[PDB]
Design a protein around this ligand. Structure first.
Ligand SMILES: Nc1ncnc2c1ncn2[C@@H]1O[C@H](COP(=O)(O)OP(=O)(O)O)[C@@H](O)[C@H]1O
Ligand SMILES: [Mg+2]
Lengths: 161, 459, 109, 600, 232, 459
């Protein structure tokens, strides 16, 4: 009796050990992705384009008459442009006049890779569209494909229902 | 997938019992999940049970104690509780919220399935035609289990329904004379019960094929009504996408019903009996009917939703509505347990709806159906004789009555009594049946035709 | 069979409780008759007529104990449960009435 | 033409901007276009009952307003098919989506438009002919069992302008063209009828013909008739589903519509597997049963609102075939699950409940459902005669026949087949109580029985007297101990056992009890009653003599007769036909008479 | 004050619509059963209905006539009058190869018309039994059973054409029993099919029961089938 | 003459169940009538239940299905449903709303009467006296019926209450030492029963004096709330203006009470026992009390309403409130029906209040009152004997108990059991009564004075 319960414990721990190792591999990828996104942010000619979209994207989700755009101070010149080019479009897609201001007193932490968060007039409704939030929001949904892409498909799964 | 950023609100309108009501919500979605953070950093989740205009009513799983009105921060995931599922969940232990508690990592999903599930198209559902050998004569003979059947054990507080379920997990095979993946939802139980099963599964050497979901008596009562769906959702993945035969055991379903009743009272829903929601049946069907084989796929799900009967009342809504949904029940009682009979299974009030297809030529032995029906007649009559003799006395009985008392006494100690590790085949069970039936002369075995008695009775 | 089959009511509670008290009193009086016959029977040990009288008395006492009272108790417990079920459905309706009145009052403000 | 979703509380959805919408119009809620039906109107907002799960429905989702009410497509292609609770074929969904789950928001034609049907006109119509509602202007050969009559829909009439010659046509073509006053109508083989409206008949007639049931009890003692209504309020395990399956398998009806409203999913699969393997000879040829049956599945774990649509779809289908001159015997195996759906919706609606939480109008819905049964003279010049019977199960909680649904049902249905849980526990199947059951069609069928049998009626009466007398004795025997019983009473008690064990119960999963032809039921009953009368006479003529024939004397002297009488069930009517069974029963009667002559 | 008349059981509009159809139906039945208008007695008996038909009337004009009371608008009485004709039509049509004498047709009409309930009468049952036999043979393979049913059915039709269905003539009564028994008999059980047919042929008083009933080509197949069966 | 054009509104506020709520209505009149024209042209009518400001709630009789909230036209009649009534309404069949169903014309308005009822001054009410000889021994002997009485028949589902009511109708008459007009209100009656009564009236040649109002079980359930008021309004015309004697039969006040419950729930009224409106007592009283005689008239109204008792009880609010309003009952039982006794009438729970005064010397027989009381007491005792016998056995009864048991058995066989096509007179009924009483020795007949015994008992 003692031998087989000890081997069961050992096999169960071995299963947990390899599972933890697999999760470490997934984390290393995501941490590399974060660094890769930072390298993209450093490129003004592509980061400004992201900001152009990211600001407008948040604006469409709130659909409020008053907007406050919050960013890290370092990127303010580009958020300013992203807002300026976003309003003409907003007034066309929604047919609603929106007063969009940038918060010059409150800033995002300096260690945020990039992106913006947008608040409504009373700061009760906010959308978080920074690069870390997008990376996790997408990665958590694409994970089923990452699992297969890195470790192979499960040979025992035949149906997708 | 969902590429749009999710919105976060600090617009809580008010709190009433377990329900947190938000206003100013953009296009609320019905039955979507909300993640909320309390002023002290505590994270909790809930589901939108109602939307109206800009308002939404969120039922919080962990509870509403400490929920603020001004500082509470909520975000809407934008979908229903779809949960991560993978093949390698077998061998893992989860809590009632779907998170691991075995110090392993979170689930690395192969897909995300809707916890509510979908009804299986009755035209593609294939009627079960295979028998599972439980090794318990009280079941394999007179109330057989088919693969894909739903058979709860109706029990009562203090009875060894946990030992019977544990026994079934180890010695459940086939009568084709096989490794079942077990998904065990331990909800509304104490530590010792959950540790009992966890230890038994390791003792059986089968833990690598067992997935546990734990929600203990000291855990939130709202999570107790998704735990079964988490277990079944995994079972559906394993059975219908990976063609693995799965055995799903849901512990005292009465803790599910009581958790549901609390929610029903909180939402002021129309009661039926004993305060339970008038839709209790529909909700139970959502849980129970996630079972059976599907045509064209080699998997199956078999359920054993054991439940405790409050005050041994077989008409209590919990066993009553279950009895209407499941294919019968095993039913244990105190009259057998109080005499140290194990397993304490009382066949008289029991049945198996799929049993008639499961027995007989091509399945077990051709006399199976005849032996079962006659044993029921003789057992029930013996019980009737005891009811008579209790008043009139032994002297008022004739030889026709004493034979049924002899059968009844020998039946319970030879047929029902076995022991936790006595594993009998279905053929041995029938042989025992005949040994007891041969107590009576042919003329009294009125449920069996002479075309069967002439072959089997002489032995 | 299992119940006397009297429709649940407060009147049924009164009748069943009086019926139960009667059955219990009869059980005790017949038990005393049996004990008196048993003592006299043992003192004699018109002998077989006492054995027949005891068997008839004990059979009736056993029936009261094993058939008639259990049946009254099952009936009474059934009545008690069903009456609380009727109380609940009244509670529900009255609660909803109070809430509807509250809603009307809010609309008026 | 659209509204917008305002709120969702589950199966009930509230929508706005629907000022012109009427009650009981169909709507399409959500981007998946979920099917629902309007219940209430509050200003420009509508309350919608949705027959598909509302999970994922958002505020602001479009709602399409459809002028047509909840309706069913009626035409060829129904028989042999299985439908969901709103008339969407499951065999077409599974053949098109390749899924094993039923998707939400599926818009599939009820009757396939690809099949080329073999159509023959009546050959009695000409251009200029005057045709009225219910007229048959052709027949489609769906199969060898049911001839599908193509009727002019009710509330339609006019002069014939074109009739399709015999040939191969599908359901999208034009078979009949008729005009009334300038307005012309072009009809195919498929008509649409709101499921909540009763199809009109020429006259509702009395029911004067048995509905044959493959059961000894539920036929000999409590007959049902063509066009009658009955309830089976059995507790769980009582076997009421098996009674419904037995009636469907082996009856004298032409069409069965089986409605699984809240039923276990395994039951509908059971039917689809087993039925194709059954036989029913037509004219010397062996044919499958499914060609004369159709079934609707709305299982317990399906949308609760759909349970109402399922019941009304089922009965509407039944009426359609009734109009064609067929005898229909539909059965909805639940009733309580329908009333349960009404309770859940009424709750979400915040309506004032009545007895035990059920809507005040529960009785209104059951009354209008059951009254659509009956033998009728059909509308239509061809003078058809049909019927719809309804055999509806009820699921009282705890087996207590006191809930509003059982109570209301018993006030509506004319035959009461009460089941006793305590008989089912003893596997005394069918678990018929036989003390609380009744049938109000006994007098109606007395004429039938006299015409074909005569002997049946006095046997039915004597059998009831024996069973009732045994119950009257059992009440006191429990207390006495069989000490004060007369010999004439002991005969009653043991003959009553003979009847109970050998006559009232039968194992429906055997080659011999799966179907019990009437001639066998009355044949073996005659023998059992003949024994009673001869055994009772034997003691009545000797009790005052110099030797009384007590039960113990006849029991030991005639033990072989008592065994033979109990064996009468094991006759296998398929292997041994009527001639052998009647001759066998005649021999048992002679054996009894000879044994009695040697006894007395 | 006519919000919901529900006349008998129909909306008034549906009731009158049924009256218009029944009038046209009788007209169609009379033209179908009696193309030459030879049955003068019966046509006169329906004169009050046929006056509204066999003429250039529009559907709406007859519908108006019903609403205005200008035609036999009693639907229940009109239904009875229709049925006693529908049953006569199928009686003649179901025996197509053997025509009835006009005197017999009128006699059968009166015998049915005078019946208290024609639908439930023996006339209806006999017609249902006849149609069960003649409908089966509409499309059947030339099997021994089907060749025997063909020969025996033609005789039944001949005898009905001579005698009608009001009198319980032993000829048609035996033929009904044997025909329905042979039809019910399982298709594979040829030994009983041959036994029943041969027993019939030599039970009838006629030397050749089929002489003049069925054509020589069918007689050649009919006898050849029996010859082959008895050959081995 | 109300020669003022009526307003028609499209200002529908909303529709909730059977109720349609209108707004912007000018001076709404309470209990007014509204004609509704549906978008497809269908016409229906309804009656106002309440008014408030510019709003009114209309009860729609035929049903609300198909009504929208934009186009439906609602015409206010300006008056209360005063119904056309005529003496030639006899020999006609109407539907539940008073419209022809028999292919006859709309009733010609000889006059109009307000169906709500005009209260009759108790000072001018004439006490009923003359006995109606119904032919049924259970009624003519014990619970006799006076002309102008109100004695409903209680029954449960499945009992032959339709046969008893039909028997009374065709056997009705006076005790002789010319006949009744029938006003028959069918509320929620199935087609099989509807033709049963219609055929029975025709077969006996009664239709010349019968007026039917048929609201069938498959007809609208709101309409039947007015049906009984239309029936009694005609009865009042025929009895108090046309000097006829009218027997009024109401096939079920329970389906009527349920119809009131449906409306009460729809308007969110505060219920009383079992969900019925707190004012059920009044709604029944205003129908039941339309009976009796009045000074100056020769006609009369006699009511014999029928009530189905839910769950076979007689404490259900429907029969409970009726018992407080009507003057006794018949009470058709089930235990007698199960024993194949017809009419299965139980004499113990059934009384007739006017019996003490409608019998005796000058009306029936000198001994009528004494025979009834003695038979009743003997029956009551006989039932107590059976209650003992069921426990102590037939061998434990004394001589008197056996006399009461023999009486009880012969009483039901010879007295109560009659058959539906045999009538017996009050004098024949009493003669049978004596035959049953003469079972006992005179010393036991303690409720009959000695003078009566000496005159009758030894005969
Ligand atoms: N008439 C019958 N003959 C034989 N077995 C029966 C019969 N009725 C029920 N049974 C047995 O009892 C079981 C219970 O019947 P079922 O219809 O499932 O119960 P319910 O009343 O809950 O619908 C069946 O599955 C079968 O095994
Ligand atoms: Mg069932």
């Amino acid at each position: 009796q003692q031998k087989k319960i000890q081997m069961s414990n050992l096999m169960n721990q071995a299963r947990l050990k390899v599972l933890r190792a697999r999760d470490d591999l997934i984390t290393d990828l995501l941490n590399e992705a974060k660094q890769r996104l930072s390298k993209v942010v450093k490129d003004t000619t592509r980061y400004q384009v992201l900001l152009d979209g990211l600001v407008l994207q948040g604006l469409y989700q709130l659909l409020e008459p008053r907007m406050i755009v919050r960013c890290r101070k370092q990127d303010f010149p580009l958020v300013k442009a992203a807002v300026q080019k976003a309003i003409p479009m907003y007034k066309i897609a929604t047919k609603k006049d929106v007063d969009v201001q940038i918060d010059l007193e409150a800033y995002l932490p300096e260690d945020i890779a990039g992106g913006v968060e947008i608040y409504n007039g009373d700061r009760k409704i906010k959308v978080s569209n920074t690069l870390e939030s997008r990376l996790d929001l997408i990665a958590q949904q694409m994970m089923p494909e990452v699992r297969g892409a890195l470790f192979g498909a499960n040979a025992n799964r035949k149906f997708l229902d | 997938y969902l590429s749009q950023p999710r919105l976060t609100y600090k617009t809580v309108s008010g709190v009433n019992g377990p329900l947190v009501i938000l206003d100013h919500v953009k296009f609320p979605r019905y039955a979507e999940i909300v993640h909320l953070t309390l002023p002290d950093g505590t994270k909790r989740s809930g589901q939108v049970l109602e939307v109206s205009g800009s308002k939404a009513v969120v039922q919080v799983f962990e509870g509403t104690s400490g929920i603020d009105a001004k500082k509470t921060s909520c975000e809407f995931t934008g979908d229903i509780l779809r949960t991560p599922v993978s093949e390698d969940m077998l061998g893992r232990v989860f809590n009632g919220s779907g998170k691991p508690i075995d110090r392993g990592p979170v689930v690395l999903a192969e897909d995300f399935l809707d916890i509510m599930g979908q009804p299986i198209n009755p035209q593609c559902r294939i009627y079960p035609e295979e028998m599972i050998q439980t090794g318990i004569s009280a079941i394999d003979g007179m109330n057989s289990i088919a693969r894909g059947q739903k058979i709860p054990i109706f029990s009562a507080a203090g009875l060894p329904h946990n030992e019977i379920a544990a026994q079934i997990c180890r010695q459940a095979g086939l009568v084709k004379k096989e490794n079942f993946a077990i998904v065990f939802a331990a909800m509304g139980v104490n530590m010792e019960t959950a540790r009992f099963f966890k230890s038994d599964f390791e003792e059986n050497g089968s833990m690598d094929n067992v997935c546990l979901f734990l929600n203990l008596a000291n855990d939130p009562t709202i999570e107790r009504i998704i735990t079964p769906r988490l277990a079944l959702t995994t079972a559906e993945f394993l059975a219908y996408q990976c063609e693995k035969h799965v055995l799903v055991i849901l512990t005292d379903m009465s803790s599910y019903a009581e958790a549901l009743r609390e929610v029903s009272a909180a939402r002021e829903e129309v009661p039926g009996r004993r305060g339970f929601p008038g839709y209790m049946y529909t909700d139970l069907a959502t849980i129970y009917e996630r079972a059976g084989r599907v045509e064209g796929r080699n998997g199956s799900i078999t359920q054993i939703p054991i439940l405790t009967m409050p005050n041994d009342d077989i008409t209590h809504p919990i066993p009553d509505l279950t009895g209407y949904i499941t294919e019968g029940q095993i039913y244990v009682d105190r009259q057998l347990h109080n005499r140290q009979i194990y397993p304490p299974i009382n066949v008289l009030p029991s049945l198996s709806r799929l049993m008639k297809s499961a027995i007989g030529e091509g399945m077990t032995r051709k006399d199976h159906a005849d032996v079962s029906n006659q044993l029921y007649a003789c057992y029930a009559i013996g019980k009737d004789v005891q009811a008579m003799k209790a008043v009139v006395g032994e002297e008022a009985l004739t030889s026709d009555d004493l034979l049924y008392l002899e059968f009844l006494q020998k039946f319970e100690k030879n047929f029902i009594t076995q022991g936790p590790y006595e594993n009998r085949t279905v053929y041995e069970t029938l042989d025992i049946g005949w040994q007891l039936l041969r107590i009576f002369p042919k003329e009294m075995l009125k449920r069996i035709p002479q075309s069967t008695l002439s072959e089997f009775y002489p032995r | 069979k299992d119940r006397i089959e009297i429709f649940p009511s407060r009147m049924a509670q009164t009748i069943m409780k009086a019926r139960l008290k009667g059955a219990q009193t009869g059980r005790n009086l017949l038990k005393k008759k049996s004990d008196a016959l048993t003592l006299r029977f043992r003192q004699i040990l018109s002998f077989v007529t006492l054995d027949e009288a005891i068997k008839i008395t004990n059979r009736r006492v056993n029936a009261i104990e094993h058939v008639i009272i259990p049946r009254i108790e099952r009936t009474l417990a059934y009545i008690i449960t069903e009456l609380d079920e009727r109380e609940r459905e009244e509670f529900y309706r009255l609660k909803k009435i109070q809430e509807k009145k509250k809603i009307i009052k809010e609309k008026s403000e | 033409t659209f509204g917008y979703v305002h709120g969702v509380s589950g199966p009930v959805v509230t929508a706005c901007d629907m000022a012109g919408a009427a009650m009981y119009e169909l709507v399409r809620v959500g981007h998946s276009e979920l099917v629902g039906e309007i219940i209430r109107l509050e200003g420009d907002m509508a309350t919608i009952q949705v027959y598909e799960e509302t999970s994922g429905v958002s505020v602001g989702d479009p709602v399409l307003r459809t002028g047509k009410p909840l309706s069913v497509e009626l035409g060829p292609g129904i028989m042999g098919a299985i439908f969901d609770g709103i008339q969407r074929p499951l065999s077409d969904i599974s053949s098109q989506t390749q899924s094993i789950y039923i998707p939400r928001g599926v818009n599939v034609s009820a009757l396939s438009r690809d099949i080329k049907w073999e159509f023959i006109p009546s050959k009695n119509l000409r251009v200029g002919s005057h045709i009225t509602g219910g007229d048959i202007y052709g027949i489609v050969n769906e199969n060898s069992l049911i001839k599908h009559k193509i009727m002019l829909p009710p509330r339609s009439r006019g002069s014939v302008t074109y009739i399709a010659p015999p040939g191969n046509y599908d359901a999208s073509d034009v078979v009949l063209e008729l005009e009334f006053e300038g307005v012309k109508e072009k009809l195919s083989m498929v008509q649409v009828w709101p499921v909540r409206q009763v199809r009109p008949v020429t006259e509702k007639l009395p029911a004067n013909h048995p509905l044959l049931t493959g059961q000894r009890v539920l036929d000999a003692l409590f007959p049902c008739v063509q066009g009658g209504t009955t309830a089976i309020p059995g507790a769980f395990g009582c076997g009421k589903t098996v009674i419904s399956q037995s009636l469907s398998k082996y009856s004298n009806s032409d069409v069965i519509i089986y409605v699984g409203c809240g039923e276990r999913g395994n039951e509908m699969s059971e039917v689809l597997r087993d039925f194709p393997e059954l036989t029913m000879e037509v004219d010397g040829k062996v044919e499958s049963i499914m060609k004369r049956t159709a079934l609707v599945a709305n299982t317990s774990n399906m949308p609760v609102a759909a349970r109402e649509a399922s019941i009304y779809t089922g009965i509407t289908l039944s009426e359609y075939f009734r109009d064609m001159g067929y005898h229909v015997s539909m059965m909805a195996d639940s009733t309580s699950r329908w009333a349960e759906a009404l309770r859940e919706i009424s709750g979400r609606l915040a309506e004032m409940p009545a007895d035990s939480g059920y809507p005040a109008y529960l009785g209104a819905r059951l009354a209008s459902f059951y009254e659509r049964a009956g033998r009728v003279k059909c509308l239509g010049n061809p003078e058809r005669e049909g019927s719809v019977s309804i055999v509806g199960a009820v699921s009282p909680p705890g087996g207590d026949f006191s809930d509003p649904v059982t109570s209301a049902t018993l006030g509506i249905v004319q035959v009461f087949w009460g089941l006793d849980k305590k008989l089912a526990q003893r596997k005394h199947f069918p678990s018929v109580n036989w003390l609380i059951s009744y049938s109000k069609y006994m007098r109606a069928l007395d004429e039938y029985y006299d015409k074909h049998f005569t002997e049946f009626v006095p046997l039915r009466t004597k059998a009831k007297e024996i069973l009732q007398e045994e119950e009257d004795l059992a009440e006191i025997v429990q207390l006495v101990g069989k000490a004060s019983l007369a010999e004439t009473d002991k005969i009653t008690l043991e003959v009553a056992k003979l009847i109970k064990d050998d006559f009232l119960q039968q194992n429906g999963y055997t080659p011999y009890d799966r179907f019990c032809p009437f001639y066998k039921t009355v044949g073996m009953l005659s023998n059992m009653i003949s024994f009673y009368d001869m055994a009772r006479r034997a003691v009545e003529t000797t009790a005052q003599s110099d030797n009384k024939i007590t039960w113990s004397i006849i029991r030991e002297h005639m033990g072989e007769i008592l065994y033979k009488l109990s064996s009468m069930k094991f006759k296998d009517p398929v292997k041994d036909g009527e001639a052998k069974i009647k001759a066998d029963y005649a021999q048992l009667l002679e054996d009894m008479q000879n044994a009695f002559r040697s006894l007395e | 004050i006519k919000v919901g008349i529900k006349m008998g059981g129909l909306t008034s509009e549906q009731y009158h619509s049924q009256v218009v159809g029944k009038i046209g139906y009788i007209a169609r039945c009379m033209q179908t059963i009696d193309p030459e208008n030879n049955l003068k007695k019966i046509r006169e008996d329906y004169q009050d209905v046929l006056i509204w038909a066999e003429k250039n009337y529009r559907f709406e004009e007859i519908l108006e006539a019903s609403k205005s009371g200008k035609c036999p608008n009693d639907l229940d009485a009109l239904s009875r009058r229709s049925l006693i004709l529908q049953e006569l039509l199928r009686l003649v049509s179901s025996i197509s190869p053997f025509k009835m004498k006009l005197d017999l047709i009128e006699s059968q009409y009166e015998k049915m018309k005078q019946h208290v309930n024609l639908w439930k009468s023996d006339y209806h049952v006999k017609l249902n039994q006849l149609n069960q036999l003649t409908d089966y043979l509409k499309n059947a393979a030339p099997t021994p059973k089907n060749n025997f049913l063909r020969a025996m059915t033609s005789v039944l039709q001949m005898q009905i054409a001579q005698y009608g269905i009001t009198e319980d003539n032993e000829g048609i009564n035996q033929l009904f029993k044997l025909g329905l028994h042979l039809l019910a008999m399982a298709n594979e059980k040829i030994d009983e099919q041959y036994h029943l047919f041969k027993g019939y042929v030599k039970d009838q008083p006629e030397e050749s029961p089929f002489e003049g009933i069925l054509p020589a080509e069918d007689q050649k197949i009919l006898v050849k089938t029996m010859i082959d069966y008895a050959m081995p």
